[PDB]
Design a protein around this nucleic acid. Sequence first.
DNA 1: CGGCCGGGCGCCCGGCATGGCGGCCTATAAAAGGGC
DNA 2: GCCCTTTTATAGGCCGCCATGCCGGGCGCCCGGCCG
Lengths: 1306, 178
Amino acid sequence: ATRLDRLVTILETGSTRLIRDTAVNQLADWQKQHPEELFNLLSRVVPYLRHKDWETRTTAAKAIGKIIENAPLYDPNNFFRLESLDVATIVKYGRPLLRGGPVDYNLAALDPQKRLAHLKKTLNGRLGLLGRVFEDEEMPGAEWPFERLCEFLKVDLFDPQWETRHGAAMGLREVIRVHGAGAGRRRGKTRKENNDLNRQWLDDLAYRLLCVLMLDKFTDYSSDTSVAPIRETVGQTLGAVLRHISVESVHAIYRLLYCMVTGMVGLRYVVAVRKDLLLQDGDMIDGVVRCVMQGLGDIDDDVRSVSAATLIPMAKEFVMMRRSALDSLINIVWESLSNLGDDLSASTGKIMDLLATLCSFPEVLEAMKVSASQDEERSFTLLVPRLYPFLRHTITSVRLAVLKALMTFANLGGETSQGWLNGRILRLIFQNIIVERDQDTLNMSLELWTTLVRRLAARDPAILADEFEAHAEPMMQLALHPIGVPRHPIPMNPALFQKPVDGHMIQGEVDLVGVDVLIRSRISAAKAMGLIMSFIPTPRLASYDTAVLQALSSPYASTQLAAAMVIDEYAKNCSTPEVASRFIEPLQKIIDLERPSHYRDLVTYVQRVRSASQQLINLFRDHGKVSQGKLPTLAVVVQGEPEAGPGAFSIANAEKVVNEDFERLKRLMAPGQRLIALPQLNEAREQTVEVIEEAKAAKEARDARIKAAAACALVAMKVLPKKPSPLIKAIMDSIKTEENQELQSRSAATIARLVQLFTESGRRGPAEKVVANLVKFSCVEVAETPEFPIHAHKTNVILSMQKEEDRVDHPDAVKYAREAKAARITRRGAKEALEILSKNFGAELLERVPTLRTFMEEPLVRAFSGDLPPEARDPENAFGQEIVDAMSVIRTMTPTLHPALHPFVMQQVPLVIKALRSDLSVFRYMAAKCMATICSVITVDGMTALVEKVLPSINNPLDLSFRQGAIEVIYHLIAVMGDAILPYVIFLIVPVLGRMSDSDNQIRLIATTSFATLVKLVPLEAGIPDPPGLSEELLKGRDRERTFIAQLLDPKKIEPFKIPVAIKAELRSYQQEGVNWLAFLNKYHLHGILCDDMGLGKTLQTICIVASDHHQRAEEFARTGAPEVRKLPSLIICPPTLSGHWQQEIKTYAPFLTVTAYVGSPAERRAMKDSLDKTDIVITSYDVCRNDIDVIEKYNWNYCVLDQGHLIKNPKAKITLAVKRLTSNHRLILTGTPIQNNVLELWSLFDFLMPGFLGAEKVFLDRFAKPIANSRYSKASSKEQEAGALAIEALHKQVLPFLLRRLKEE
Amino acid sequence: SGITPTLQNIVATVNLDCRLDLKTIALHARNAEYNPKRFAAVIMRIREPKTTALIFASGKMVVTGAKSEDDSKLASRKYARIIQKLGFNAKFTDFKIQNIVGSCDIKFPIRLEGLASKHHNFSSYEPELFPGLIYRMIKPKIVLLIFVSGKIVLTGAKVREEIYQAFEMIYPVLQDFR
DNA sequence: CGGCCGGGCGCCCGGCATGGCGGCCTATAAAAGGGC
DNA sequence: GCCCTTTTATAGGCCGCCATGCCGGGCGCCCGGCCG
């Protein structure tokens, strides 16, 4: 078969969907190149529309779509007349279309044209044109180019083999959606005349479509609702066709519909694309309301799901021209909606939303009132509770719809809203709030509760308490429920939930979801109850006061935390904070008085400790041949159990046992048993230590968890302590160490309030302490503020890159990982704390509290703006860490700065830009990220500073300490700003690249990774917008970067470049193009792979480019004398047998190039140690290189080129190791194909091109390559395949621009 | 008292009360299968909850795959409504459940041999074809599959209490063998 | 200087050994109507 | 009356071939010796 057939059959046999997408893209590209291939392409792909697979038909249809999209509209210069359609021909004369039966071999064997004619006759039969339900035995460029294909597609619309329906519907859609306007036109009739012919053709199509839309009832009830396999596709196709249809034809089709409807989705698919005609004609918009009048009460739920989807765009101009239908619509909506006992409500949500957005208008209030004037049953006063039963439906989308619709009805206002504001909804919404898992529902519902309770309070908080009281106490008790741990839950008594799923919450099955989600469910009820608690009168609160007192005193651990946050909510809305004064002594005692002997919530941990200890205690002394009842044993009763005695077992008992019972056991089991039991005793001691430490850590953390919220409450009530040490230190410890993110989010606000409260009080002292600790904590994570005493000695080191090299070696023990996760949690809290404290003061931020400004400036301006004293640059000093600390603060605080504080950071800008060149890298690391942050946030000024001072000197060779930062800052910039650097490409891309071609260890690497991420970032399919708000002096018409980006993105944009040197062999056009790309690579210190077919004159292009660069270096040196073009020979690597070949080629094309071959007798190879520089070109076999690499590596070289580089692929071979040692100004890779169906091939090669461009094997294998290969296997998996292939194309994009592949035909 | 088993499948017998043209239905929708050359019943699945249906032309059906009685019933009713949608009338007349399947797990492995010897009159151990001990009991009539990893599967029950009882009866014998 | 040869090696590709994870088969429950 | 199908726990073996991991035969290439 042809290559085109292979490209087509991939659409069925493609291993991945993305490869088939590439196949259809290639087919469309071939169509673009060769429009004459359109019909062959269609006829080849069209047969797959009858294929069995869902995906294969979809792919063939999409192939047709892409192919026709790359084809022009047609222009030259029998039809079933539409009015013939009637109910009878479909309902009582037409053949039903259903599941395909056995193959019609008797007809399929005939010629396609004869078969088409026979199918046409049988189609005339099938439609009911004969007046009976007939039997098969009665019938046993001058014109539209797609006409025969269109006829086949239309005949395929009625195949019993239903796969043909699904495929051919999409195919005909792909024809008419793109070339609908041109369909049916023929020569003879002029354009104005054949417009009518096009109208008739599209009318015939609509006729057949309407015939299908009820003749075919094929169905799949597998899904509970969406039982439409092929009705929906043909309906959507009709919708696509409908946009071209003439208005009177739309009227006729609309008549056919609204008589047929009494295919219902056809009404939606015409409301999509002729909404204007419905309003303009006036009458035709009646059909959308009449359909819901007819259908919305039907028993069938298969069209109830559809009926809502038509109606959303309607009721805007309708309200003027057809006002009368509004009341009827809403009334029939509410009647159908109230069908309690029905099991689906999907369309109901959309209808509710449509009503809701209507309810924003006074006309809809009047619509309610006009119907309410006749009856109270349909009144807004009594109707709303029919929403109540829907609160706990299973599908979450309709839950969200319920919430938002309720909100809009709450927005209706008016005294009539009191009809359902009665306490029923007050209890029901809270019952929804308490246990709901889904975050979005919680988010909306808290707002809904707030608006509702505010509305009710607007009359009187007394009547609010009246509405709530009868349900109050059980609800509050539910709000004070405990919390537990996996496989030991605590459920809730369902008797407390009034009636109008949920089982995982009712049973308290914490195994399913993380406890943070449970705490979300708790804070939701907390915030819901807090507002009402504050609003209602204080004298009513006695029972509530007792409830919170119990929660404060209860042995259940969670209740103290819940109570503390509860009182925080209460205080934060109080008219005066002293109203909550009655909670001063409890919470302050919670933070002050010693935490309990036992935590009931932790009871399971205690039992686990007892069991895990006794299983050893009873083991070992019995293993010492001594078991007696009076010997030490842990008590049967465990403290915290229900009705447990005071003497019950506790963790302190375990501590008492393990302290001295181990040596007592050893002495007791002395005669022999100790020797044989000692290792078991060791692991037993380890196990006891593990479990005891676990329990103690849990208890301490829980103590902190209670105390943190307690301090939050105390701060909230504004009862500031006169001895602030415990409160502030508890706040700090909680902020540092809080495990739950929600409690951390609360504690951030706690401290952010506390600082302002201290500022009001005037006691700057404790404020200074807490803020100093806060900023001090920010340096904990090793990846954000490296330890000065650890890294201080390193010099001439690219310090930030150490994370790639050696930081992965640290995890040698659990002790390191523990502190690592602790650091992450600490910074997570710190960011929120600093963020909120930044925002709250805003423009006055540095003014309010000066000490933060002092910490932000003083070390940087005391150390820099000068030179470091000897102690400041002493690796064991006191001051050394301080500099990196302040720089950490600056690089953290920046993006939360208020705009008014911008002059401060711009005053800091002079310090860092000068400091960046410093000798001590430890400061350069902090400076790099800080500069990246300034550049990211205050865009214009940071960009100006960077481009105007940091960048322009980047090429100066003298100052190495500046040179390292000059690229390190660019790398951190690319990281921090991500793709947002893309508009700023016009100041970086070339000068940053130029760093690759300068010989300086570590510098070479960081540059390569920076350039690689840039290359990834540039779009493959988009241009560069103008940089936003940049001064003209910055830009100043720097189109060199634009040219570089253009040539990088497209080889065809590279300029021609003839040979400057006098090479005897002239370049042919393909040779010239290759030379053009090679020059473009040679023009910016890039390296790459050339992979031309050998028939194209392989060697000539390479030898031409190297000779050209040799001459250019010589002449530039004559003109400039610059070091950069220093004389070095070129070095070529090739097979030994090819050596001579190359030699002779050199003599032929370029006799001016002198040749030295590093070959001959071993003696002579030993003898030529220094002679090598005496000729322009050096010739080398792979293997003489592999031996004498110790020898050969002395001199640098101009060009290093691999002739047959395929041998180099191995990631470990001595040849690969050997070659890579060499250094030069240019290098290239010559191979037949770089990527020959294997991605693994490339890594080594690329490294050889660019150390540090793609990265090391530590990421190439683990991240991409291995999973790539795995997922690529057919037998592997089904899920990852598409993601795998997308990643494949990502690798192609990363590796394409520095590869040039050309076929010999080119 | 031993720990209760956990229920895992339900089989239901359901009465449609109408004669049906099976061949027609097969070609009517995608979600079914029926061939006398393969089997008598129409095999059909639905998703919500995941279930399989055997339907017989005389007007009865056997329904499978529910975890719970209420779930089972819901599934059955949905099936019946589906039937109603097909175009041939039917009703949810009768409902019966048999062989409710449950499972239990305990720590200790079970000495199959010893048990089998104890109840040799009632139990057989044949590790040459099935790595489990079939234990037969009368009151309630329950088939117990006893496995050597501490796992017992209970079958033939009508009600969960039956399996409960069965497990309660067997559990002391288990405790005798660890 | 010019050359053929036995002995030499790093390294690649083929046949092989092999095990993870997979259907299938036992128990095999219990409707049902059916084929034979 | 025996065998047919369905679904859920299940446990271990029976077999299967894919990727995996391997390393011996052989490749090309070098090269120390000795030939003329």
